[PDB]
């Protein structure tokens, strides 16, 4: 029967993150014996905490024999946002495009990125580079998995608990800031809405200076957290605008059409809705702008106006998420622009 007595302690609370492993999965994993996939998953929640400004949560493993062998599921708070295989014994061959040719193994597709790749022996190595192939090992699969699953879901990866964590670890460097800011100025709940819309649009929240100034200065006039959110945002205009527009060259954007910005930014004041028609007009030219500006080879970066911006963004992201959407009032005074690319008459 059951041994033991149930405990308070049977009570297992649901994970922000957490990943459930097949047996063969079990010595990657393990934390007796050094897990491989243990340090790498240490690595990329380190290089998170230090490109975007936050840790992720901890990572809770588990096995689970309900599941294949060889496979491991990516929960966050409980459901499954992400699942795969990966093969211990095996290596993972991956083809960027370039390298051409065909190898033995199982025939399958990078979990992150998406581009096709073969599982092969440890033999094989060897050639699978010299044809070309980007060979990675079963362990760092997984952890290429996981680091893109974090990247998608950054912004719901953050919550109430990561921003009072956050705004303590700005408190023990800049105590001044904070201290009588929240829950005085701005309380805890709007601090972490606005971080959490800037992550969503992968604006870094590694400046908080910036941020938490900008706040006690609106804060006080201003309370809605979509506000907030779009000043803070130029206040950021040089780290964003650096951020897709590296060194002083010349940026080239995308642009929408002069009489269409009429069409939205009036029926903007008139009831925060939207009419069909329009939206799936969009959707679709859009969709051919980001590959003219593919073919060129330049950031797929929509600047607008900025009374726009903000639901423009909301909006084509949740089907376009690759797409940046910057305001005029961002990009930098002193830049170079060009709006090669635009949603005219066609």
Same mark, same amino acid.
């Given at each position: 029967?059951?041994?033991?007595?149930?405990?308070?302690?049977?009570?297992?609370?649901?994970?922000?993150?957490?990943?459930?492993?097949?047996?063969?999965?079990?010595?990657?994993?393990?934390? /007796?014996?050094?897990?491989?996939?243990?340090?790498?998953?240490?690595?990329?929640?380190?290089?998170?905490?230090?490109?975007?400004?936050?840790?992720?949560?901890?990572?809770?493993?588990?096995?689970?024999?309900?599941?294949?062998?060889?496979?491991?599921?990516?929960?966050?708070?409980?459901?499954?946002?992400?699942?795969?295989?990966?093969?211990?014994?095996?290596?993972?061959?991956?083809?960027?495009?370039?390298?051409?040719?065909?190898?033995?193994?199982?025939?399958?597709?990078?979990?992150?990125?998406?581009?096709?790749?073969?599982?092969?022996?440890?033999?094989?190595?060897?050639?699978?580079?010299? /044809?070309?192939?980007?060979?990675?090992?079963?362990?760092?699969?997984?952890?290429?998995?996981?680091?893109?699953?974090?990247?998608?879901?950054?912004?719901?990866?953050?919550?109430?608990?990561?921003?009072?964590?956050?705004?303590?670890?700005?408190?023990?460097?800049?105590?001044?800031?904070?201290?009588?800011?929240?829950?005085?100025?701005?309380?805890?709940?709007?601090?972490?809405?606005?971080?959490?819309?800037?992550?969503?649009?992968?604006?870094?929240?590694?400046?908080?200076?910036?941020?938490?100034?900008?706040?006690?200065?609106?804060?006080?006039?201003?309370?809605?957290?979509?506000?907030?959110?779009?000043?803070?945002?130029?206040?950021?205009?040089?780290?964003?605008? /650096?951020?897709?527009?590296?060194?002083?060259?010349?940026?080239?954007?995308?642009?929408?059409?002069?009489?269409?910005?009429?069409?939205?930014?009036?029926?903007?004041?008139?009831?925060?809705?939207?009419?069909?028609?329009?939206?799936?007009?969009?959707?679709?030219?859009?969709?051919?702008?980001?590959?003219? /500006?593919?073919?060129?080879?330049?950031?797929?970066?929509?600047?607008?106006?900025?009374?726009?911006?903000?639901?423009?963004?909301?909006?084509?992201?949740?089907?376009?998420?690759?797409?940046?959407?910057?305001?005029?009032?961002?990009?930098?005074?002193?830049?170079?622009?060009?709006?090669?690319?635009?949603?005219?008459?066609?």
């Amino acid at each position: 029967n059951s041994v033991v007595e149930a405990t308070w302690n049977d009570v297992q609370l649901e994970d922000s993150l957490g990943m459930e492993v097949g047996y063969r999965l079990i010595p990657m994993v393990d934390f /007796q014996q050094d897990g491989e996939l243990l340090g790498r998953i240490r690595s990329i929640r380190k290089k998170f905490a230090q490109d975007m400004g936050f840790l992720p949560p901890v990572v809770h493993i588990r096995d689970n024999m309900d599941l294949q062998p060889a496979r491991y599921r990516i929960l966050m708070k409980g459901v499954e946002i992400g699942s795969g295989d990966a093969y211990p014994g095996r290596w993972l061959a991956i083809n960027p495009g370039t390298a051409a040719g065909t190898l033995p193994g199982e025939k399958t597709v990078d979990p992150a990125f998406g581009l096709d790749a073969i599982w092969i022996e440890s033999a094989l190595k060897e050639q699978a580079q010299i /044809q070309g192939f980007t060979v990675v090992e079963a362990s760092t699969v997984v952890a290429t998995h996981l680091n893109h699953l974090i990247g998608q879901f950054s912004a719901e990866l953050f919550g109430r608990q990561e921003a009072q964590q956050l705004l303590d670890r700005v408190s023990q460097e800049m105590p001044k800031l904070t201290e009588d800011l929240v829950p005085g100025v701005v309380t805890l709940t709007t601090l972490h809405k606005v971080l959490q819309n800037l992550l969503a649009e992968k604006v870094p929240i590694r400046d908080m200076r910036t941020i938490l100034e900008t706040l006690a200065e609106h804060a006080p006039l201003q309370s809605d957290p979509h506000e907030l959110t779009a000043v803070v945002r130029v206040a950021l205009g040089r780290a964003i605008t /650096q951020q897709w527009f590296p060194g002083n060259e010349e940026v080239q954007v995308i642009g929408l059409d002069t009489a269409l910005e009429r069409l939205l930014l009036q029926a903007l004041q008139g009831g925060g809705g939207l009419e069909p028609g329009l939206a799936d007009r969009l959707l679709a030219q859009t969709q051919e702008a980001l590959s003219r /500006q593919e073919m060129l080879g330049a950031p797929p970066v929509l600047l607008v106006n900025h009374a726009l911006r903000p639901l423009l963004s909301r909006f084509l992201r949740r089907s376009l998420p690759q797409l940046v959407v910057l305001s005029n009032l961002e990009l930098s005074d002193n830049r170079h622009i060009r709006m090669t690319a635009t949603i005219g008459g066609k």
